[PDB]
Amino acid sequence: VPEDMVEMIESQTLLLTYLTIKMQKNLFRLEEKAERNLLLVNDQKDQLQETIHMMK
């Protein structure tokens, strides 16, 4: 195997790995922001529901 083929595969591996780590870090930040936003809205829903029940 020409010393040149092993070097190419390694270069491909480096590109994919870099893309992967970069994506994972940015995805985790979105997931955390999203869940926070959902919880905040859910809490508003819960307060409105309690008030409606008491009035009824």
Binding site: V1, V6, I9, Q12, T13, L14, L16, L19
Partner: peptide
Amino acid sequence: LQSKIQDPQKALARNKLARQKY
């Protein structure tokens, strides 16, 4: 990644794993 693999079979396996992870 800095440790140069000289065995083609080992390099292939490593690449497959990287591809999958992505």
